[PDB]
CSV table of C-alpha atoms in Angstrom, one decimal:
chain,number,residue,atom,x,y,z
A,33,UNK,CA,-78.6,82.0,56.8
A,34,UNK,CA,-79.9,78.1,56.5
A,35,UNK,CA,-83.1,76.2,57.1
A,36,UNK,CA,-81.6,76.0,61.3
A,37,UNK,CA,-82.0,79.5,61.4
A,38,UNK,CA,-85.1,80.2,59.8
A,39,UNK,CA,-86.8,77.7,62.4
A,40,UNK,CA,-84.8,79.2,65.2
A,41,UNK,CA,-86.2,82.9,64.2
A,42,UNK,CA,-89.4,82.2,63.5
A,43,UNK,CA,-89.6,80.3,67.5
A,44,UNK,CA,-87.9,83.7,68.7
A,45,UNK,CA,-89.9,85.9,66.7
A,46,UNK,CA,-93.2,84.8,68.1
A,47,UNK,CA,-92.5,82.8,71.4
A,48,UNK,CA,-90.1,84.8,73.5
A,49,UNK,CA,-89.9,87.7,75.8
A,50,UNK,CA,-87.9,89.5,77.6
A,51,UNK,CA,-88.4,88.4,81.4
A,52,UNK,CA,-86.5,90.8,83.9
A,53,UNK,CA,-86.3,88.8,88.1
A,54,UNK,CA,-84.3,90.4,91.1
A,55,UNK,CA,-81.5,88.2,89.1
A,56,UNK,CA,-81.2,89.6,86.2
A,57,UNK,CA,-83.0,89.8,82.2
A,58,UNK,CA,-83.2,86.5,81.0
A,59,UNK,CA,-85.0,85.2,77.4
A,60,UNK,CA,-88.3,83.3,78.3
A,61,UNK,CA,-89.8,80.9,76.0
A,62,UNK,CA,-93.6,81.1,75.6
A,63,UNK,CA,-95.0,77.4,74.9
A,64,UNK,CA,-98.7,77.8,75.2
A,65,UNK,CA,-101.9,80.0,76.9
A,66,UNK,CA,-100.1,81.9,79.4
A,67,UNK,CA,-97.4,79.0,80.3
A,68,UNK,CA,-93.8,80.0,79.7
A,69,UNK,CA,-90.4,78.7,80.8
A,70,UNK,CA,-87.1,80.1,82.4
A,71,UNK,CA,-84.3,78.8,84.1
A,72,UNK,CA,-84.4,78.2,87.8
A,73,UNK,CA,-81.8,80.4,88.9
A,74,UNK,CA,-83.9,83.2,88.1
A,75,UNK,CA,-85.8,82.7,91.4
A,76,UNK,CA,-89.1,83.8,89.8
A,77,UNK,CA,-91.9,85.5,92.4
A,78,UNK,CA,-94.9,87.0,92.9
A,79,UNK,CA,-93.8,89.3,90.3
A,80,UNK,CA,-92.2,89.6,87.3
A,81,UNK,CA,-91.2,92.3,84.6
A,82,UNK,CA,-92.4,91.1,80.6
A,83,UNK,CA,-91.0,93.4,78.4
A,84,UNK,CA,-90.7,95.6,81.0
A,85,UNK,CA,-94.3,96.1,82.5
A,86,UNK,CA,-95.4,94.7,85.9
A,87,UNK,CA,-96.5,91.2,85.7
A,88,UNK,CA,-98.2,89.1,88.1
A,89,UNK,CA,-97.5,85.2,88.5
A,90,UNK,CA,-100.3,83.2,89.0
A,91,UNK,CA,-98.2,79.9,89.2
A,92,UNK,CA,-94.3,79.0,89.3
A,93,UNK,CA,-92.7,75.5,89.7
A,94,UNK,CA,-89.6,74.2,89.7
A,95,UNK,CA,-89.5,71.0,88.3
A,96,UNK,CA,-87.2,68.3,89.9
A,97,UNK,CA,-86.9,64.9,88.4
A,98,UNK,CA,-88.8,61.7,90.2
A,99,UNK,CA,-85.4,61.1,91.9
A,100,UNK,CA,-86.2,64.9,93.3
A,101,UNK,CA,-83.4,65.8,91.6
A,102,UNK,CA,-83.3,69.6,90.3
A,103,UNK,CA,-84.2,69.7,86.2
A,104,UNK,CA,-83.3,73.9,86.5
A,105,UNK,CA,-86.3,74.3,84.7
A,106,UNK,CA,-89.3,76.8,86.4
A,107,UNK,CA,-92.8,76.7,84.4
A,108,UNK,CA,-94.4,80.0,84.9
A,109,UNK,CA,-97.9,80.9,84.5
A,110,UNK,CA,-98.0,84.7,84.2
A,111,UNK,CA,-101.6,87.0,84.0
A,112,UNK,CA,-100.5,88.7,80.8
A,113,UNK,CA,-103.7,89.6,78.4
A,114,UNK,CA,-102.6,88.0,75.3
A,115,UNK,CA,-101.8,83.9,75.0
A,116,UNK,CA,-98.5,82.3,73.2
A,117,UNK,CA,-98.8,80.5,69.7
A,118,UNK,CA,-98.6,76.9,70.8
A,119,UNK,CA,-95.6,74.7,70.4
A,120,UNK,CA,-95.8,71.9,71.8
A,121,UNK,CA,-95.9,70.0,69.5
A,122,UNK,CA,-92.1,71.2,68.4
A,123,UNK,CA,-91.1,69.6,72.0
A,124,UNK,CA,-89.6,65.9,71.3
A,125,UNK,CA,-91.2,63.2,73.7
A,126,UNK,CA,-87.9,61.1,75.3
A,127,UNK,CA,-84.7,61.8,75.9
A,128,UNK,CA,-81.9,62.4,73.0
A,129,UNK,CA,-78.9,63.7,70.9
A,130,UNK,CA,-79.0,66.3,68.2
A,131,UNK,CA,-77.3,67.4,65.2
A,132,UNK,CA,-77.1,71.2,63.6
A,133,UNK,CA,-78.3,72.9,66.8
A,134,UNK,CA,-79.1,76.7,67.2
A,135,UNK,CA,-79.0,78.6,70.5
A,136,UNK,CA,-81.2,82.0,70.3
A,137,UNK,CA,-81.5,84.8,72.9
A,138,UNK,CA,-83.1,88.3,72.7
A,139,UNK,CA,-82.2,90.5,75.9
A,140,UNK,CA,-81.4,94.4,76.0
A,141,UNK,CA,-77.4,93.2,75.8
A,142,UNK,CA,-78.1,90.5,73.0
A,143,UNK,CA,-80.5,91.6,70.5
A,144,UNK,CA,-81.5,89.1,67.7
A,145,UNK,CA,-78.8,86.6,68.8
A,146,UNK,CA,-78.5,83.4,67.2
A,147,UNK,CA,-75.2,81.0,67.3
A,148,UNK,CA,-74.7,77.9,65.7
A,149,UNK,CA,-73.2,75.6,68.4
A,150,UNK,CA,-73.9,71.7,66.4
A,151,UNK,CA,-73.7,68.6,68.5
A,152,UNK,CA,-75.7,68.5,71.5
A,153,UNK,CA,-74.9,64.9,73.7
A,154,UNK,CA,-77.4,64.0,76.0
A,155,UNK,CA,-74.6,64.6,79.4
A,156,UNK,CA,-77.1,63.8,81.8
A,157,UNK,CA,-76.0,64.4,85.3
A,158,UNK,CA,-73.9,67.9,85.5
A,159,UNK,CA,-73.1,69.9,88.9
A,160,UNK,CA,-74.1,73.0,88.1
A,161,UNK,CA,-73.2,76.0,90.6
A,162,UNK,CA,-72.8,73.1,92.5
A,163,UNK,CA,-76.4,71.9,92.3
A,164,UNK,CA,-76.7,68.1,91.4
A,165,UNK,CA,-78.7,68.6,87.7
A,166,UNK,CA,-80.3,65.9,85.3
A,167,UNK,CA,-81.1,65.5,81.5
A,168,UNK,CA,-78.4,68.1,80.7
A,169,UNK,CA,-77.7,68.9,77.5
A,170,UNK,CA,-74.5,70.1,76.3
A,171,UNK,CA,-72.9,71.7,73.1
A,172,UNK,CA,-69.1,72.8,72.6
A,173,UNK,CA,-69.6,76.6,72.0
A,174,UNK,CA,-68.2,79.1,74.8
A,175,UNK,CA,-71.2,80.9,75.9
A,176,UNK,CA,-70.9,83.8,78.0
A,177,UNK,CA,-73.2,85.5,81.1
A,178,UNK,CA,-76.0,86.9,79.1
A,179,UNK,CA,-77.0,83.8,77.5
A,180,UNK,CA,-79.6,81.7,79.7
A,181,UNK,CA,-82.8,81.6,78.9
A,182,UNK,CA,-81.2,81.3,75.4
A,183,UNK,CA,-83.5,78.8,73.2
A,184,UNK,CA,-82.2,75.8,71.8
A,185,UNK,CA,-83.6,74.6,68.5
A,186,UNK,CA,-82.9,72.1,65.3
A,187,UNK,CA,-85.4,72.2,62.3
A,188,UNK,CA,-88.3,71.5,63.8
A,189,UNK,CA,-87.7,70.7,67.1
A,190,UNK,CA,-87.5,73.1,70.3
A,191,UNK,CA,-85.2,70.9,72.7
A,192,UNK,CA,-84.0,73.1,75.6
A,193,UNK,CA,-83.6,76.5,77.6
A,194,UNK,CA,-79.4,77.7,78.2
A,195,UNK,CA,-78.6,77.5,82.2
A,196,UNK,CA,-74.6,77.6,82.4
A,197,UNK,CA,-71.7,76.7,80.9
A,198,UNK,CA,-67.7,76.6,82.2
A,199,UNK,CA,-65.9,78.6,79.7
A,200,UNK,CA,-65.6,75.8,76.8
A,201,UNK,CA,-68.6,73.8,76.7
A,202,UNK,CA,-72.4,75.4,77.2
A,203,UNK,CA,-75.7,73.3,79.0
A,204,UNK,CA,-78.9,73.2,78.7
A,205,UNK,CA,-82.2,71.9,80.7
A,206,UNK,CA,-84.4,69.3,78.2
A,207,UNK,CA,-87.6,70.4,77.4
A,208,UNK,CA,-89.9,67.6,77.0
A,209,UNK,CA,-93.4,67.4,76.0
A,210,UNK,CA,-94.6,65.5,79.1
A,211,UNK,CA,-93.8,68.8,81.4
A,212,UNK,CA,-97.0,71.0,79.4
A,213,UNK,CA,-99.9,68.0,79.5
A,214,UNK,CA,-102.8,70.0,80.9
Protein backbone atom coordinates (compact mmCIF):
# COMPACT_ATOMS: atom_id res chain seq x y z
CA UNK A 1 0.00 0.00 0.00
CA UNK A 2 3.07 2.48 1.02
CA UNK A 3 6.83 2.66 0.47
CA UNK A 4 6.94 0.04 4.12
CA UNK A 5 5.32 -2.42 2.09
CA UNK A 6 6.90 -2.29 -1.16
CA UNK A 7 10.35 -2.86 0.76
CA UNK A 8 8.81 -5.50 2.88
CA UNK A 9 7.53 -7.47 -0.43
CA UNK A 10 10.24 -7.19 -2.43
CA UNK A 11 12.53 -8.85 0.88
CA UNK A 12 9.69 -11.59 0.93
CA UNK A 13 9.52 -11.96 -2.66
CA UNK A 14 13.11 -12.94 -3.17
CA UNK A 15 14.58 -13.94 0.27
CA UNK A 16 12.17 -16.32 2.03
CA UNK A 17 11.11 -19.85 2.08
CA UNK A 18 9.03 -21.97 3.40
CA UNK A 19 11.15 -24.07 6.02
CA UNK A 20 9.07 -27.15 7.51
CA UNK A 21 11.21 -28.84 11.17
CA UNK A 22 9.64 -31.72 13.38
CA UNK A 23 8.11 -28.31 15.01
CA UNK A 24 6.26 -27.02 12.65
CA UNK A 25 6.42 -24.61 8.99
CA UNK A 26 8.08 -21.61 9.83
CA UNK A 27 9.18 -18.42 7.22
CA UNK A 28 12.98 -18.44 6.78
CA UNK A 29 14.89 -15.50 5.68
CA UNK A 30 17.56 -16.14 3.15
CA UNK A 31 20.52 -13.51 3.76
CA UNK A 32 23.29 -14.59 1.56
CA UNK A 33 25.11 -17.97 -0.44
CA UNK A 34 23.34 -20.66 1.16
CA UNK A 35 23.08 -18.91 4.90
CA UNK A 36 19.52 -18.39 6.07
CA UNK A 37 17.89 -17.74 9.47
CA UNK A 38 15.07 -19.12 11.67
CA UNK A 39 14.09 -18.99 15.04
CA UNK A 40 15.55 -21.39 17.61
CA UNK A 41 12.62 -23.09 18.72
CA UNK A 42 12.48 -24.71 15.54
CA UNK A 43 15.14 -27.21 16.68
CA UNK A 44 16.72 -27.36 13.13
CA UNK A 45 18.66 -30.99 12.21
CA UNK A 46 20.28 -32.87 9.91
CA UNK A 47 17.39 -32.27 7.85
CA UNK A 48 15.15 -29.94 6.75
CA UNK A 49 12.11 -29.54 4.24
CA UNK A 50 12.60 -26.10 1.75
CA UNK A 51 9.60 -25.66 0.04
CA UNK A 52 8.84 -28.98 0.70
CA UNK A 53 11.79 -31.05 -0.82
CA UNK A 54 14.42 -32.92 1.38
CA UNK A 55 17.17 -30.68 2.39
CA UNK A 56 20.39 -31.35 3.92
CA UNK A 57 22.03 -28.97 6.61
CA UNK A 58 25.51 -28.53 6.30
CA UNK A 59 25.78 -26.13 9.35
CA UNK A 60 23.25 -24.86 12.24
CA UNK A 61 24.12 -22.56 15.19
CA UNK A 62 22.39 -21.16 17.70
CA UNK A 63 23.66 -18.08 18.59
CA UNK A 64 23.82 -16.95 22.30
CA UNK A 65 25.05 -13.60 23.39
CA UNK A 66 28.86 -13.23 24.98
CA UNK A 67 26.98 -13.44 28.34
CA UNK A 68 25.90 -17.09 26.82
CA UNK A 69 22.75 -15.83 26.91
CA UNK A 70 20.17 -17.38 24.27
CA UNK A 71 19.70 -14.64 21.13
CA UNK A 72 16.72 -17.35 19.66
CA UNK A 73 18.34 -16.86 16.55
CA UNK A 74 19.78 -20.34 14.53
CA UNK A 75 21.96 -19.50 11.31
CA UNK A 76 21.51 -22.39 8.95
CA UNK A 77 23.59 -23.34 6.15
CA UNK A 78 21.48 -25.58 3.91
CA UNK A 79 22.99 -27.68 0.48
CA UNK A 80 20.24 -26.20 -1.67
CA UNK A 81 21.60 -25.67 -5.54
CA UNK A 82 20.67 -22.10 -6.00
CA UNK A 83 22.22 -19.04 -3.59
CA UNK A 84 20.01 -16.04 -1.91
CA UNK A 85 20.30 -12.36 -3.27
CA UNK A 86 22.43 -10.83 -0.63
CA UNK A 87 21.21 -8.45 2.02
CA UNK A 88 23.33 -7.74 4.24
CA UNK A 89 23.84 -4.79 3.67
CA UNK A 90 19.86 -4.04 4.69
CA UNK A 91 21.05 -5.49 8.33
CA UNK A 92 21.68 -2.21 10.67
CA UNK A 93 25.08 -2.53 12.59
CA UNK A 94 24.17 -1.73 16.68
CA UNK A 95 21.47 -2.01 18.54
CA UNK A 96 18.11 0.24 18.12
CA UNK A 97 14.48 1.50 17.94
CA UNK A 98 12.31 1.81 14.88
CA UNK A 99 9.45 3.60 13.48
CA UNK A 100 6.71 2.37 10.61
CA UNK A 101 7.63 -1.34 11.03
CA UNK A 102 6.25 -4.27 8.81
CA UNK A 103 6.12 -7.91 9.88
CA UNK A 104 5.89 -10.34 6.77
CA UNK A 105 5.33 -14.19 6.80
CA UNK A 106 4.58 -16.60 3.91
CA UNK A 107 3.55 -20.21 5.27
CA UNK A 108 0.82 -22.72 3.75
CA UNK A 109 -1.72 -21.00 6.68
CA UNK A 110 -0.43 -17.34 5.86
CA UNK A 111 0.09 -16.68 2.40
CA UNK A 112 1.46 -13.21 1.28
CA UNK A 113 1.02 -11.84 4.88
CA UNK A 114 2.15 -8.49 5.69
CA UNK A 115 0.91 -6.36 8.97
CA UNK A 116 1.83 -3.10 9.94
CA UNK A 117 2.72 -3.24 13.62
CA UNK A 118 4.80 0.58 13.95
CA UNK A 119 7.00 1.14 17.02
CA UNK A 120 9.47 -1.41 17.73
CA UNK A 121 11.42 -0.52 21.43
CA UNK A 122 14.61 -2.12 21.81
CA UNK A 123 13.05 -4.47 25.22
CA UNK A 124 16.11 -6.18 25.73
CA UNK A 125 15.93 -8.96 28.17
CA UNK A 126 12.47 -10.95 27.73
CA UNK A 127 11.64 -14.57 29.26
CA UNK A 128 10.49 -16.21 26.58
CA UNK A 129 8.79 -19.83 27.14
CA UNK A 130 10.70 -19.19 30.00
CA UNK A 131 14.12 -19.00 28.43
CA UNK A 132 16.20 -15.87 29.60
CA UNK A 133 16.40 -13.93 25.86
CA UNK A 134 18.50 -10.67 24.83
CA UNK A 135 18.22 -7.81 22.22
CA UNK A 136 14.46 -8.42 22.04
CA UNK A 137 12.53 -6.49 19.99
CA UNK A 138 9.02 -5.68 20.59
CA UNK A 139 5.91 -4.16 18.76
CA UNK A 140 2.23 -3.72 20.19
CA UNK A 141 0.36 -5.90 17.50
CA UNK A 142 -1.30 -9.35 18.75
CA UNK A 143 0.34 -11.85 16.80
CA UNK A 144 -0.92 -15.26 16.70
CA UNK A 145 0.84 -19.06 16.36
CA UNK A 146 1.64 -19.04 12.71
CA UNK A 147 3.70 -16.07 12.74
CA UNK A 148 7.52 -16.72 13.69
CA UNK A 149 9.79 -16.76 11.31
CA UNK A 150 7.78 -13.67 10.27
CA UNK A 151 10.27 -10.92 8.82
CA UNK A 152 10.54 -7.59 10.29
CA UNK A 153 11.38 -4.69 8.02
CA UNK A 154 11.25 -0.66 7.78
CA UNK A 155 12.27 1.06 4.37
CA UNK A 156 15.41 -0.17 3.91
CA UNK A 157 16.35 -1.96 6.77
CA UNK A 158 15.77 -5.83 7.65
CA UNK A 159 15.83 -5.70 11.58
CA UNK A 160 14.55 -9.08 12.95
CA UNK A 161 12.94 -12.62 12.73
CA UNK A 162 9.11 -13.03 14.87
CA UNK A 163 9.82 -15.70 17.92
CA UNK A 164 6.71 -15.17 20.41
CA UNK A 165 4.53 -12.89 21.69
CA UNK A 166 1.82 -12.94 24.92
CA UNK A 167 -1.42 -12.04 23.40
CA UNK A 168 -0.96 -8.04 23.25
CA UNK A 169 2.49 -7.32 22.43
CA UNK A 170 4.75 -9.47 19.67
CA UNK A 171 8.95 -10.05 19.93
CA UNK A 172 11.44 -10.38 17.84
CA UNK A 173 15.27 -11.62 17.75
CA UNK A 174 17.74 -8.51 16.21
CA UNK A 175 19.40 -9.27 13.35
CA UNK A 176 22.65 -7.60 13.12
CA UNK A 177 25.17 -7.45 10.54
CA UNK A 178 28.05 -8.69 12.75
CA UNK A 179 26.23 -12.36 12.89
CA UNK A 180 26.94 -12.92 8.63
CA UNK A 181 30.91 -11.64 8.48
CA UNK A 182 32.45 -14.51 6.58
Amino acid sequence: MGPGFDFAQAIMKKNTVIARTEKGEFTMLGVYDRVAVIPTHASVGEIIYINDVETRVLDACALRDLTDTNLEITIVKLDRNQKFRDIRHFLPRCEDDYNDAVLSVHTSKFPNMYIPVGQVTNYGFLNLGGTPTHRILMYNFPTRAGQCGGVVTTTGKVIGIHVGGNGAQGFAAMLLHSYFTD
